[PDB]
Subunit: 287 residues, 4 copies
């Protein structure tokens, strides 16, 4: 009977931006995939078609390119600017969500204006403003890692549906998808992203894994213990199975050398490693 | 300082299952992409690498195929069975999240056992168990729609970043991604899905649009009003932009006929339509 | 040593076009992804950087939309026009390749101007011009089909690496990708596309398959036998394996009901079925 | 009336192999996606369903793994071993096409058995045997490059559909996709791959481009002049358009700094650069 408009947001998603810094002959490249969405009072827009409060998504796109013209130090900075502009620029706009993907480029032979893309990982950033409160989550995705040894899995329960054999030597392969929430905007965004990345990789490589979960925990622990500006870090790590091929039918053995890299299905292990006493479920995670 | 383990879950993702029904010569097909993840006490598995609590993801995969053997009336029914099995079968497992994509097949000229894949839409379902509670959210995705007219957009604010021209006749195209949460598990799942799908299309096509937000609202309102077992319905609708090409430079006009369908960027209108006073904060929306 | 500029072609690829026909209240939609490349004397363009001969890819893009304004009866007739224009309007352009994908849309409850996409198959067409010569290849792709029975595979050689067991009852699933070359341009393009599709689907469904090879041969046989204007039909059919899951370790049998649809690897069976005597290697298959 | 079986081939596509070298503590990783297809006399398999000649695609897959056990020095060497084994092992198999994608891994902090995937490019190899002849084409793809200046495009034709503005300074970005054919199987496959990669990158960056066509020519020329074992190199380069946004409506100028990276459409520039006197159109290019 009584229908009501609940949570809502809207804007321009995936605005591809490339900003070249060419004040000197040594060109700089900044590449982002930006998404802007606003939150506020849009009751009439949905219920009556009254667009008085609707700052056009096209306009939000236009603002991204306009602000880019002034350049930005980091991705978070750029997002911070867009957020303040929209929330303060309009009364009915109480907040919103601004995200971006940062694509890495390397110079070709240290060239002044020639680069090639580094597709090994994608950096992300999300900004969420709610009234007077702000929150930034930085992250990394698409970084694939693998250990040829130094990994085992055994001691798990065995029901009538269990056929997996225990092991003390296997391959551990996953894609690093991690996201950490800063407990303050005053952060050296580039330095911390670099550090977090290094910590994750090191923990993955040096930890003798008894389970992907254990490895993930150690990766998460290293970050929290190292950075006071981070309250928590979430990770979604798939266990990309590399099955040891059975060659015995052909009278050949396989000493952990020949594997079949299966696509699907795959284990999916996820968890949140936080600083004891930090907020439990921040809104930024709701998206 | 003190690193703690927060929310966490694990299982086997994307188990592709095809169940054929052939007790009679008239074969039936059920094609699913199943995901199983468990929640409970996995404290030791993460901090000590003690897997006594770790029901193998491989075992979960096996349980899916074993259960499929007995058949299932609906996708939601199949998931409820998997959920009940793991929560009740292990004391440290107090809940989980079981999801699936259902793919549709049509008979080739009414043949008894030959079919063709209907890729126009993908059906979804996600079951979340929290102790005694079992929440189910069904959905639809990949259903692309378009109105060649009967859509306008005007009356929006115009700041210094606004260039968009108002219009009373444009194309409105989007990908229908809708998801709805049932307030009860006693639902005729297949019939409700078919009904919701029809209400969504009808509303999109018959609503004279003043904005994508108004269309979406009318789409959601229709569903909430028709089905009492539905508390809320969320939609994420991209505004797939079809730009009327400027042919004047070629000496021709363009009476809303020739369009350029842009990939990115795109508007992204999202909202939750619901029964007044319902729990628009359910955890299942956290994933 | 000496370097020689060999085969070459250039143009604008993937120009997304949507043509709405709204003369009556009942609108019609034509959706295409068009690619236009030119061939001719571009020696100086590559070797010297002289663009005198380079009809801009941008210009080619504009021509596609300008021509769209006048409407077109079929996708093939649109390409024919595009090709004649470029070869005839420039002395240095001696030919080229014009391709297009055609996406289908269905009305939402027989509505005058509201539709939903039918993604179950994508229609294709390729036109190649070489001086006075002109050839057209029409095709279909992305059409997934599956037989739950009426498929066998036995009698193959058992070499020292063969573990596959003979079977007289299995699932046969594939993606139908078929392309046929017309011996003349005077064809009811739409009627023939409808027919071929119907013949392929029928041949796939009704043929008691002893091998994907046999099935594919019959599919192409029906096409050549039914249409005199077609000289040959090429098919590329993956054998999308659906493995009958072994449930015996769980104390269950599996009467051809529970399957695991694997992603990779997959059998890839391909072949050309042609009219006796027709050409062996038309340049149009060279791309 | 009379239908005949023309060209044909079949086998197992996309066999994911990971070969770990660990006879020492310093592990090595070889990661490939292998496709195996046979050519010969399969007339009966297609026409009558007689599989006596059909070496199962499943067997071909098994062979890939059995062979991997022994190890291989290079992707091309491994392909040659497969090609030779099948053609010689069966009388009715007179040739085939073996293809492979090689994915690269980097040690994590020079660790012995922990790596991270380098996704900035994918290496390719195609071996085609025809009787006593065996041709090998190696390649690179997925390598994205960009010049922020040092590129222009002017002097092109202008007709009624020409609107592109001439420029003396623009962004030149593309996806480097290249394939070169060897004139002999006696090559240091890995050294040449690296050499060619560097030459393409160097020619792209340093050449002051007057058109993508010219840049590509210089890239091909450098490779041919440098390596005697290469008869020709083919390149397929899209012109990834980065449009200089019009910021004047916002009260700003845009001195070649803020760009919009469009997805589609895109220019597609392709050409073959070969050693003078070399073969015109080798069959391997037809696949
Ligand atoms: O690390 C792992 N965690 C799991 O939960 C699991 N299940 N199977 N293999 C596994 N590996
Ligand atoms: O339907 C629309 N809603 C919006 O909010 C919008 N902004 N630009 N175009 C738009 N179209
Ligand atoms: O480099 C280019 N080559 C072309 O042929 C072209 N056409 N438009 N822009 C172009 N740029
Ligand atoms: O129909 C088939 N053809 C083949 O070539 C094959 N190989 N394995 N199974 C097969 N089935």
């Amino acid at each position: 009977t009584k229908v009501v408009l609940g949570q809502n947001q809207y804007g321009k998603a995936e605005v591809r931006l490339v900003k070249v810094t060419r004040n000197t002959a040594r060109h700089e490249i900044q590449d982002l995939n930006v998404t802007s969405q606003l939150r506020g009072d849009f009751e009439a827009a949905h219920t009556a078609g009254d667009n008085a409060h609707v700052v056009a998504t096209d306009t939000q796109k236009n603002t991204v390119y306009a602000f880019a013209r002034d350049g930005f130090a980091t991705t978070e900075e750029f997002l911070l600017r867009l957020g303040k502009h929209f929330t303060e620029g309009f009364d009915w706009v109480t907040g919103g969500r601004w995200a971006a993907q940062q694509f890495f480029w390397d110079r070709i032979n240290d060239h002044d204006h020639a680069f090639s893309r580094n597709k090994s990982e994608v950096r992300t950033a999300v900004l969420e403003i709610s009234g007077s409160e702000q929150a930034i989550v930085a992250g990394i995705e698409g970084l694939t890692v693998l250990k040829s040894t130094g990994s085992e899995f055994h001691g798990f329960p065995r029901d009538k549906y269990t056929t997996l054999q225990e092991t003390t030597d296997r391959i551990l392969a996953t894609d690093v998808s991690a996201r950490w929430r800063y407990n303050t905007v005053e952060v050296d965004f580039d330095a911390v992203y670099a550090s977090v990345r290094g910590l994750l990789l090191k923990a993955f490589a040096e930890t003798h894994s008894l389970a992907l979960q254990q490895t993930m925990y150690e990766m998460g622990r290293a970050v929290i213990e190292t950075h006071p500006e981070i309250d928590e870090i979430k990770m979604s790590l798939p266990n990309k199975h590399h099955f040891l091929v059975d060659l015995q039918p052909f009278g050949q053995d396989n000493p952990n050398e020949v594997f079949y890299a299966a696509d699907r299905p795959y284990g999916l292990i996820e968890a949140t490693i936080q600083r004891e006493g930090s907020r439990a479920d921040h809104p930024i995670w709701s998206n």
